[PDB]
Amino acid sequence: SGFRKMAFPSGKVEGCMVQVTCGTTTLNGLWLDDVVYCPRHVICTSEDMFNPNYEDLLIRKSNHNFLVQAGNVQLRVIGHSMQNCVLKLKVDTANPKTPKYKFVRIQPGQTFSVLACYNGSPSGVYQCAMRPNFTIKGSFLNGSCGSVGFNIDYDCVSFCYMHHMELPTGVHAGTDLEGNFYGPFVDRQTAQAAGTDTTITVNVLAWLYAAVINGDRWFLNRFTTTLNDFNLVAMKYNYEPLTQDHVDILGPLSAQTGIAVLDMCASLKELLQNGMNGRTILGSALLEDEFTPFDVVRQCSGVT
Amino acid sequence: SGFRKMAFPSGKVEGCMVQVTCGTTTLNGLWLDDVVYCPRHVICTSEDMFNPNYEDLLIRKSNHNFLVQAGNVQLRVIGHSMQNCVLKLKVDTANPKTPKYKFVRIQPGQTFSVLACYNGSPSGVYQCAMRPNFTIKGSFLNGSCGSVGFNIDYDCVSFCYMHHMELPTGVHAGTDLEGNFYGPFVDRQTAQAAGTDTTITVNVLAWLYAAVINGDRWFLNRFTTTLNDFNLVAMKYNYEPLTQDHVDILGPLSAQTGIAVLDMCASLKELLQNGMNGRTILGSALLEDEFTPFDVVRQCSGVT
Ligand SMILES: *[C@H](O)[C@H](C[C@@H]1CCNC1=O)NC(=O)[C@H](CC(C)C)NC(=O)OCc1ccccc1
Ligand SMILES: *[C@H](O)[C@H](C[C@@H]1CCNC1=O)NC(=O)[C@H](CC(C)C)NC(=O)OCc1ccccc1
């Protein structure tokens, strides 16, 4: 037993991380086949980053201006292109460690693993949710851009996130591997708002189910509710409205625990209205919303 | 900015995980050079596990009774020995992916990364502290034994933990890579007590420093204290007594923030006595003690 925020093993992605330097700016790139993907603001000086004209900046750059290093070994850049907010650098060597991979645009409420990197070298790994307001709550310093987020399904790495920036609220923003930002964000150093950070209701319920699967049951009560009545309380607390598809997704955890989803909803309602009275759930004193139902099943079933 | 529980990249350890089956029992092994390390209870049937006589059970086993698989590829076992609570299986092939490595016995209060595995295949990665009562709070199912915990310093993997069992309280217990349990535990299915779970004071302070490094400062007050007076309150709350060596270890975070350690101690005292009044620190509503000072510096400096 036990329940922990758990990242995927990072080995397959470690072998894809390179360093990309353009002038004075160094960040990370993702090397897959003969292409290196990185954030386009690698072509910016610090001054340029407040209002870059990326097309104009990029025109002053040639292949030899992009220094790409895989470990100690320099890669030869033979072409470059800009796709939305990422650069694709073509190199003369296919990465021999390229895993089976896909690029995917994840949906809000889904989770993924971040391999935080500096100077092309991995620093650590942790799980994030793409929040409903299309930000993530990560750990990123100067030099971390180009770090990527991913999921693994057996053998295949689905890359879904590349890191670009931090918002004034301390949350983090980035793109899919085609260079399209999640959310309304642009890669320039202006003040930008993410909007209300609503809570992923279905994930909170999944984590309450995880708590019961793992022995924590004090919050279970004698009440039930309805979707519409629950949601009247979801709105007040800036929770996402719960839908029958959410109910179905919780099916396996509901079946597996014998607790009807709407009964658990009634437990959640009481926790929202009355707090946790100094108690804890799976070692937390807050309602946790960054575990998907799949994450709960995956962990409690030992999926590898 | 941002602060997250962060595991080391697992790639170097992934390449060392194998499957070890003895009869009906399958668990994980660690393959380094021509030796596979695994928990000795792989030789037990389910019945044997309540009161095994390991020496007697092991005498009925020969090399060919240990099936060791690296991915799809069978390894040939050419010798076996029992060292404390682990088996060393000698195989005829040196692991070509063996990293630079050390075996270390970590001290209580230090952290490490767990690569949870099933059937010799990695499932996920997460950070644990060796708690003062020599348990860890992990996520482990049937089949997870032989999963290992480790630290990396640049190129060298220091293995410090191998997983063996779960206590009735839902916490986890295991050995160093020489097979010696952390704590008073034995590998048999009896009820076993870990004792009072005291809190790692120096780590809580480090995490309060991390909170300030990352913008959370509401808990800073106008008070200071002394070591002896602080500890009078540490005892009541089952915190470890704070020592001057702890104070020195916090030196870099104290210097880096301009907050005297004893001033921060006064903040912690008030948080213990008055709770957090519904507020949060680095996204938590509890005082977090599983980050070492080193962990805080490492993360906030981008060590790779
Ligand atoms: C890429 O390495 C970097 C990551 C930032 C730096 C601190 N934490 C992060 O997530 N991105 C930028 O520096 C980004 C570049 C623009 C062209 C979008 N600018 C940015 O995030 O500005 C806000 C900021 C910068 C430096 C420190 C704190 C906030
Ligand atoms: C090794 O795979 C296994 C890991 C346990 C199983 C559930 N969670 C864990 O950490 N260890 C054992 O099964 C261990 C073997 C003895 C010879 C020490 N026995 C054990 O941990 O018993 C308690 C227990 C067993 C099964 C489910 C829940 C608790």
Side-chain angles (χ1 to χ4, degrees), chain A residues 1-46 48-59 61-153 156-216 218-221 223-234 236-304, chain B residues 1-46 48-59 61-153 156-216 218-221 223-234 236-304:
Chain A
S1 71
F3 197 71
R4 291 293 312 282
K5 222 182 276 280
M6 200 168 162
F8 294 98
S10 56
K12 284 167 166 171
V13 177
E14 289 174 48
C16 303
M17 299 314 308
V18 298
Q19 175 181 264
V20 179
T21 303
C22 189
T24 191
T25 309
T26 293
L27 47 67
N28 305 282
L30 183 73
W31 183 20
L32 300 166
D33 304 317
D34 59 347
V35 176
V36 175
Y37 305 78
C38 69
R40 68 175 172 173
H41 73 256
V42 71
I43 73 183
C44 298
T45 69
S46 300
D48 296 326
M49 289 177 187
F50 297 100
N51 198 13
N53 185 316
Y54 283 104
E55 290 75 10
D56 285 356
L57 288 166
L58 185 56
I59 286 168
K61 302 298 184 176
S62 303
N63 292 330
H64 67 263
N65 296 132
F66 295 101
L67 300 169
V68 184
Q69 215 179 310
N72 189 40
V73 158
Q74 212 70 28
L75 301 188
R76 195 175 292 278
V77 177
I78 60 172
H80 64 271
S81 65
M82 178 170 63
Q83 170 174 27
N84 301 308
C85 298
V86 294
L87 299 185
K88 301 195 282 192
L89 310 178
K90 190 179 195 194
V91 297
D92 67 356
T93 308
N95 183 357
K97 298 176 175 163
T98 308
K100 290 195 189 68
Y101 73 88
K102 289 174 180 183
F103 294 164
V104 307
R105 187 167 175 91
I106 44 75
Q107 277 278 295
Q110 298 299 304
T111 55
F112 55 93
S113 293
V114 174
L115 184 65
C117 297
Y118 299 87
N119 302 115
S121 288
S123 169
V125 69
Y126 52 89
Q127 198 85 331
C128 291
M130 181 57 62
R131 300 202 54 77
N133 69 1
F134 287 110
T135 64
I136 72 177
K137 299 188 297 209
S139 183
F140 295 103
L141 298 170
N142 291 103
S144 63
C145 284
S147 298
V148 298
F150 59 101
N151 285 95
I152 314 188
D153 186 346
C156 184
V157 183
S158 296
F159 296 99
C160 59
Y161 178 87
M162 175 168 275
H163 184 56
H164 291 247
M165 63 190 306
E166 174 173 316
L167 303 187
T169 53
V171 302
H172 298 112
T175 67
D176 65 20
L177 268 293
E178 301 187 329
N180 295 302
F181 264 90
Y182 295 96
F185 310 117
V186 297
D187 48 342
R188 73 203 34 251
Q189 258 163 207
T190 311
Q192 298 177 58
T196 312
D197 183 17
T198 73
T199 301
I200 310 161
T201 312
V202 62
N203 287 4
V204 177
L205 298 171
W207 168 85
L208 291 176
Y209 276 107
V212 171
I213 287 169
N214 284 275
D216 276 348
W218 63 266
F219 47 87
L220 301 180
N221 66 21
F223 297 81
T224 194
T225 189
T226 65
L227 282 185
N228 283 357
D229 291 312
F230 172 82
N231 285 337
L232 291 171
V233 185
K236 178 182 154 93
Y237 288 88
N238 290 327
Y239 272 54
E240 290 190 332
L242 194 78
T243 76
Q244 184 62 42
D245 295 321
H246 294 151
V247 179
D248 290 339
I249 281 146
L250 295 164
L253 296 176
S254 179
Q256 182 181 334
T257 51
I259 306 188
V261 173
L262 292 176
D263 292 2
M264 192 62 92
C265 284
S267 285
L268 176 51
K269 167 181 176 176
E270 295 301 328
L271 292 169
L272 288 171
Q273 288 171 345
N274 312 134
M276 294 168 64
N277 287 282
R279 309 267 298 172
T280 65
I281 297 170
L282 290 179
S284 181
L286 304 179
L287 302 171
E288 181 57 62
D289 82 336
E290 296 214 348
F291 290 106
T292 68
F294 184 51
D295 294 338
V296 185
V297 170
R298 274 205 297 110
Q299 187 167 153
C300 299
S301 74
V303 159
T304 296
Chain B
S1 71
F3 197 71
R4 291 293 312 282
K5 222 182 276 280
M6 200 168 162
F8 294 98
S10 56
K12 284 167 166 171
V13 177
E14 289 174 48
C16 303
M17 299 314 308
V18 298
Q19 175 181 264
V20 179
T21 303
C22 189
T24 191
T25 309
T26 293
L27 47 67
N28 305 282
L30 183 73
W31 183 20
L32 300 166
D33 304 317
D34 59 347
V35 176
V36 175
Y37 305 78
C38 69
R40 68 175 172 173
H41 73 256
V42 71
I43 73 183
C44 298
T45 69
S46 300
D48 296 326
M49 289 177 187
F50 297 100
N51 198 13
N53 185 316
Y54 283 104
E55 290 75 10
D56 285 356
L57 288 166
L58 185 56
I59 286 168
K61 302 298 184 176
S62 303
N63 292 330
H64 67 263
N65 296 132
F66 295 101
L67 300 169
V68 184
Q69 215 179 310
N72 189 40
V73 158
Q74 212 70 28
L75 301 188
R76 195 175 292 278
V77 177
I78 60 172
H80 64 271
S81 65
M82 178 170 63
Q83 170 174 27
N84 301 308
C85 298
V86 294
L87 299 185
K88 301 195 282 192
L89 310 178
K90 190 179 195 194
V91 297
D92 67 356
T93 308
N95 183 357
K97 298 176 175 163
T98 308
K100 290 195 189 68
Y101 73 88
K102 289 174 180 183
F103 294 164
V104 307
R105 187 167 175 91
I106 44 75
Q107 277 278 295
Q110 298 299 304
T111 55
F112 55 93
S113 293
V114 174
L115 184 65
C117 297
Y118 299 87
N119 302 115
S121 288
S123 169
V125 69
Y126 52 89
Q127 198 85 331
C128 291
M130 181 57 62
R131 300 202 54 77
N133 69 1
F134 287 110
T135 64
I136 72 177
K137 299 188 297 209
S139 183
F140 295 103
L141 298 170
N142 291 103
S144 63
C145 284
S147 298
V148 298
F150 59 101
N151 285 95
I152 314 188
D153 186 346
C156 184
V157 183
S158 296
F159 296 99
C160 59
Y161 178 87
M162 175 168 275
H163 184 56
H164 291 247
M165 63 190 306
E166 174 173 316
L167 303 187
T169 53
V171 302
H172 298 112
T175 67
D176 65 20
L177 268 293
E178 301 187 329
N180 295 302
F181 264 90
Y182 295 96
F185 310 117
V186 297
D187 48 342
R188 73 203 34 251
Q189 258 163 207
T190 311
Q192 298 177 58
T196 312
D197 183 17
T198 73
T199 301
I200 310 161
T201 312
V202 62
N203 287 4
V204 177
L205 298 171
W207 168 85
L208 291 176
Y209 276 107
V212 171
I213 287 169
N214 284 275
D216 276 348
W218 63 266
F219 47 87
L220 301 180
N221 66 21
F223 297 81
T224 194
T225 189
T226 65
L227 282 185
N228 283 357
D229 291 312
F230 172 82
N231 285 337
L232 291 171
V233 185
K236 178 182 154 93
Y237 288 88
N238 290 327
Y239 272 54
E240 290 190 332
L242 194 78
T243 76
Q244 184 62 42
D245 295 321
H246 294 151
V247 179
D248 290 339
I249 281 146
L250 295 164
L253 296 176
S254 179
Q256 182 181 334
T257 51
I259 306 188
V261 173
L262 292 176
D263 292 2
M264 192 62 92
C265 284
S267 285
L268 176 51
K269 167 181 176 176
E270 295 301 328
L271 292 169
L272 288 171
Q273 288 171 345
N274 312 134
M276 294 168 64
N277 287 282
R279 309 267 298 172
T280 65
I281 297 170
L282 290 179
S284 181
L286 304 179
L287 302 171
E288 181 57 62
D289 82 336
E290 296 214 348
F291 290 106
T292 68
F294 184 51
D295 294 338
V296 185
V297 170
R298 274 205 297 110
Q299 187 167 153
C300 299
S301 74
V303 159
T304 296

